[PDB]
Design a protein around this nucleic acid. Structure first.
Ligand SMILES: [Mg+2]
Ligand SMILES: [Mg+2]
Ligand SMILES: [Mg+2]
Ligand SMILES: [Mg+2]
Ligand SMILES: [Mg+2]
Ligand SMILES: [Mg+2]
Ligand SMILES: [Mg+2]
Ligand SMILES: [Mg+2]
Ligand SMILES: [Mg+2]
Ligand SMILES: [Mg+2]
Ligand SMILES: [Mg+2]
Ligand SMILES: [Mg+2]
Ligand SMILES: [Mg+2]
Ligand SMILES: [Mg+2]
Ligand SMILES: [Mg+2]
Ligand SMILES: [Mg+2]
Ligand SMILES: [Mg+2]
Ligand SMILES: [Mg+2]
Ligand SMILES: [Mg+2]
Ligand SMILES: [Mg+2]
Ligand SMILES: [Mg+2]
Ligand SMILES: [Mg+2]
Ligand SMILES: [Mg+2]
Ligand SMILES: [Mg+2]
Ligand SMILES: [Mg+2]
Ligand SMILES: [Mg+2]
Ligand SMILES: [Mg+2]
Ligand SMILES: [Mg+2]
Ligand SMILES: [Mg+2]
Ligand SMILES: [Mg+2]
Ligand SMILES: [Mg+2]
Ligand SMILES: [Mg+2]
Ligand SMILES: [Mg+2]
Ligand SMILES: [Mg+2]
Ligand SMILES: [Mg+2]
Ligand SMILES: [Mg+2]
Ligand SMILES: [Mg+2]
Ligand SMILES: [Mg+2]
Ligand SMILES: [Mg+2]
Ligand SMILES: [Mg+2]
Ligand SMILES: [Mg+2]
Ligand SMILES: [Mg+2]
Ligand SMILES: [Mg+2]
Ligand SMILES: [Mg+2]
Ligand SMILES: [Mg+2]
Ligand SMILES: [Mg+2]
Ligand SMILES: [Mg+2]
Ligand SMILES: [Mg+2]
Ligand SMILES: [Mg+2]
Lengths: 271, 46, 93
RNA sequence: GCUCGCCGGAAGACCAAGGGUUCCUGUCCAACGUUAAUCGGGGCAGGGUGAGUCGACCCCUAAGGCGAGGCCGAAAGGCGUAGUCGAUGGGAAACAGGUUAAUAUUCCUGUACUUGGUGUUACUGCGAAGGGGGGACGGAGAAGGCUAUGUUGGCCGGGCGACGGUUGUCCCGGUUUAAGCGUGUAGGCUGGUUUUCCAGGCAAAUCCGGAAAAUCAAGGCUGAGGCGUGAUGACGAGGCACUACGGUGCUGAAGCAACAAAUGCCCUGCUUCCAGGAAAAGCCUCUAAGCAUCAGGUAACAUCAAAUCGUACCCCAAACCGACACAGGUGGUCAGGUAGAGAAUACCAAGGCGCUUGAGAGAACUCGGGUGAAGGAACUAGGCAAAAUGGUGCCGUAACUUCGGGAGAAGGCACGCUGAUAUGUAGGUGAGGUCCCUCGCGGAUGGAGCUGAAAUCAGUCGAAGAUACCAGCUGGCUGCAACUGUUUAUUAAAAACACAGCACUGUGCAAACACGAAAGUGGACGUAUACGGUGUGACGCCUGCCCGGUGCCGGAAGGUUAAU
RNA sequence: AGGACCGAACCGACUAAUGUUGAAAAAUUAGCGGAUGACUUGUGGCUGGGGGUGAAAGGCCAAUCAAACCGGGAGAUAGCU
């Protein structure tokens, strides 16, 4: 559900809130948590290497089954949980033989379903299997990129890939981003679309909001002094630059990708 | 009003103490000089 | 533990004072300067032998020697263990 | 010594950090002390810090640090694996009273408790660096039950009033008692036990997880306080003797109830929400290598052990940071009486103080204040500064609006005391007595006593009853910024920055980007509903035309063109 | 419920006067803003000088900052006083 908040107070009047009743209440399943410590965006040289990252809420990490290896063994959806560390919700699944696991909650997953993996597995929302055994045309999420390495593509709320060609030993995915890239067909992948999809109807509605998600403020270069940012100073609102990174590199359109090493695999660049 | 020197033994010995000087080339060198100039107190101690 | 050598070396001197005195009256306790490195045990042991009396319990503390700076250049008095030795009840020397 | 005044959510009392003898006594007065000083945080000498259970060491880990071998780097050196360090967090146990000139939960008295070694005895599967439990975790809000505490009555000791009255419905004081042990209440959570079987818990498992049945429903886990004991005790006014008049010894009454009541406790609870809320050991259990008449394991008793180092004193300051005995700064704990919403504020209590030159004068002028005829912004850059408003409850309140607001708009009305309803009302509280019963810290009945607003009527005093302190001035027009936030420590708090929102633009993950000769690492344990760069700045209504210039994207046939 | 309202603590720093060889190398007094949050604060850690950090003022990095402090090249050079 997607809710408007009443204007009982400015900075709460523009709040649009995504509240979901099918989500477990209370702490996750402890056995699957680790520590995760915040980083201010600083690396092992103590230097800020990525701007704007500080504070806001504390976060436990939940171990998520990106790989999906327990083939042949069914499991059922104990329940649906929120996860502070990503936009997708998640499924607490009980495997027949006792072992438990988290997985990315896909579009329609309800409590008490039966997901499964392996070179067989019923082609149904929730199930994992190699793509050489997935019908071209299918739409699939959490897509492995090397066989075995585990999910890397389409892991985010609302997203999915669509297989649009087999052929060869590789398939050819339509990436959420418009791109089309070949990818060896033994790379596993999941039936369905990744779940939470009204994610992108939230509005925050107030500055804090963003803070308490670890985001610190963004200072326009045109608000800095020449010394600081290539976008210079002013003297009653001036710019006159050719838009750039803080570090003399160009935005408004210069291309950055440079791999060669992985050019082979890309078949159509996004548009 | 709040001035710049706010003591703290724990921090002191960590920042300049004998052992910290010993940790490294250029702290061993602080000590080294101080010994050459014949200092009474190499560092600050118990 | 004996190391009778030690037990002889561990009792240094009696210690005199109001407190020390009233402490002998009221509490059948006796107060000694004892090696800095001595343990309550070592203190009990040697007191038993050397002073043939029965020791019920031993308390210690370390006295910090005062400081007396005489113009620019200063000086400090060294540090010693003070020893409260209680005497069981069979009370003698 | 007797007054007087000041603080009393502090100007008291405690901790911690920092200080390092400032502590206590004797003695001294040069210099230090904004004055004298016989005094002192000054000189000099002496005394003073006592712990199994307060703290630190110790065990555990956080961020972070170091780091065999290792990866990388002209040398220096940077990273980092196993490990090892690092509390600001987890981890065993003590209380009340007494005593010193100065230490005390440490010494004494009394009464406890913790975990180990040794033994004895009875009884048993014990056994990790491993598994599982657990330790183990946010915010907000709610209201019940409690205690700390206090009020009054009672009880006990004392009192009969410097001046009219005070043998009583009078006055004053006190009325305090711990840990521990026992009990398992208010209340919270969860159904239990047996058997069988299993792809999980790196091997193993009796444990955890999962699947089956069978069976009984009452079982367990947690848990403040009360009560009992501890206590034959301690403390307790006051007496009674001595007194170097400083004190010491001796003895010692009552020691209850009702009512009010935290912000403390039950509560690591409950309810609820999005931002979704440390780790590791101790601890319980489970087995592995193992050991099997041993060792161990469990329990009673008995016994030995618990080291070392801190402990004086200052504590929101004369001892700490401020060159000063400096109107500054400095985290945490304790919260009495009356009035009060209150931790505000005024006055007291306990406790601590009158701030280390005083004495007179009673000019100008300065500073800080009180009142002011008539006038009332005429002042002035500007109502700067003043003056004024100021509580509660009810009545009532416009434009405009994003329907929340505006709004405490504006403006009215009441306010003290006494009596009556009602010799104290509604409410709260709740004892005897009665009956029950799984009889308990139980239920129902019952209403004594206790406490107790608000209201209307009437009467009454003053110039005035939100009487002091304390405590909104209101309204109309209009610029800019949506808004709360941020900022020039020390002349700029704003219309500047940020901001939710929008847009462009890059980015397929070994991402772009960034710190890095590099290794390594942030980005991210993320993956295009994501992440970066840039500009715009809620929202409503909108966002037109120009690609010549400059930038950028695409292109390629020619032309020109490097090393070679 | 809320970057909700009023208002102590706490955080701040809008106005005036005082002070200006100060009580003080930025404060006192009376008024003022926030005061459940982008709040406030203890303890310890990390980032280092053409480097940091910066809700951006050239702000802050130990009474300082359009390039900290210390030592060194060092008796820099000074057609200037
Ligand atoms: Mg932005
Ligand atoms: Mg921006
Ligand atoms: Mg600027
Ligand atoms: Mg530049
Ligand atoms: Mg201009
Ligand atoms: Mg003892
Ligand atoms: Mg000791
Ligand atoms: Mg004080
Ligand atoms: Mg001295
Ligand atoms: Mg003098
Ligand atoms: Mg003194
Ligand atoms: Mg002295
Ligand atoms: Mg090495
Ligand atoms: Mg290292
Ligand atoms: Mg350690
Ligand atoms: Mg600690
Ligand atoms: Mg004392
Ligand atoms: Mg035994
Ligand atoms: Mg474990
Ligand atoms: Mg009570
Ligand atoms: Mg009379
Ligand atoms: Mg003390
Ligand atoms: Mg003074
Ligand atoms: Mg002072
Ligand atoms: Mg007050
Ligand atoms: Mg005086
Ligand atoms: Mg004075
Ligand atoms: Mg006046
Ligand atoms: Mg007048
Ligand atoms: Mg008049
Ligand atoms: Mg008038
Ligand atoms: Mg004029
Ligand atoms: Mg005029
Ligand atoms: Mg004014
Ligand atoms: Mg006024
Ligand atoms: Mg009345
Ligand atoms: Mg105008
Ligand atoms: Mg603004
Ligand atoms: Mg300024
Ligand atoms: Mg200002
Ligand atoms: Mg973005
Ligand atoms: Mg702008
Ligand atoms: Mg608010
Ligand atoms: Mg306020
Ligand atoms: Mg003020
Ligand atoms: Mg400065
Ligand atoms: Mg330069
Ligand atoms: Mg030279
Ligand atoms: Mg020169």
């Amino acid at each position: 559900a997607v809710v408007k908040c009443k204007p009982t107070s400015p900075g709460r009047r523009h709040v649009v809130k995504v509240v979901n009743p099918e989500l477990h209440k209370g702490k996750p399943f402890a056995p699957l948590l680790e520590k995760n410590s915040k980083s201010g965006g600083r690396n092992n040289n103590g230097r800020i290497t990525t701007r704007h990252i500080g504070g806001g809420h504390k976060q436990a990490y939940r171990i998520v089954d990106f790989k999906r290896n327990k083939d042949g063994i069914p499991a059922v959806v104990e329940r649906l949980e929120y996860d502070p560390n990503r936009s997708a919700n998640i499924a607490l699944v009980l495997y027949k033989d006792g072992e438990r696991r988290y997985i990315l909650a896909p579009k329609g997953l309800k409590a008490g379903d039966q997901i499964q993996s392996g070179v067989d597995a019923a082609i149904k929302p929730g199930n994992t299997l190699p793509m050489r055994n997935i019908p071209v045309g299918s739409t699939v999420h959490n897509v492995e990129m090397k066989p075995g390495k585990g999910g890397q593509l389409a892991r985010s709320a609302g997203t999915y890939v669509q297989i649009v060609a087999r052929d060869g030993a590789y398939v050819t995915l339509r990436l959420r981003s418009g791109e089309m890239r070949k990818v060896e067909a033994d790379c596993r992948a999941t039936l369905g679309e990744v779940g939470n999809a009204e994610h992108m109807l939230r509005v925050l509605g107030k500055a804090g909001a963003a803070r308490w998600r670890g985001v610190r403020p963004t200072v326009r270069g045109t608000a800095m002094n020449p010394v600081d940012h290539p976008h210079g100073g002013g003297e009653g609102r001036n710019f006159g630059k050719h838009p750039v990174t803080p570090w003399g590199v160009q935005t408004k359109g210069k291309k950055t990708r440079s791999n060669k090493r992985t050019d082979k695999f890309i078949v159509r660049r996004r548009s | 009003m709040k001035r710049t020197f706010q003591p703290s033994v724990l921090k002191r010995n960590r920042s300049h103490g004998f052992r910290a000087r010993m940790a490294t080339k250029n702290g061993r060198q602080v000590l080294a000089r101080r010994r050459a100039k014949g200092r009474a107190r190499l560092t600050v101690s118990k | 533990m004996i190391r009778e050598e030690r037990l002889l070396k561990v009792l240094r001197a009696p210690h005199v004072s109001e407190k020390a005195s009233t402490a002998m009256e009221k509490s059948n306790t006796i107060v000694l300067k004892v090696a800095k490195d001595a343990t309550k045990a070592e203190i009990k042991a040697a007191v038993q032998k050397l002073f043939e009396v029965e020791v019920e319990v031993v308390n210690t503390l370390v006295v910090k020697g005062k400081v007396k700076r005489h113009g620019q250049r200063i000086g400090r008095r060294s540090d010693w263990k003070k020893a409260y030795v209680t005497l069981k009840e069979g009370q003698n020397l």
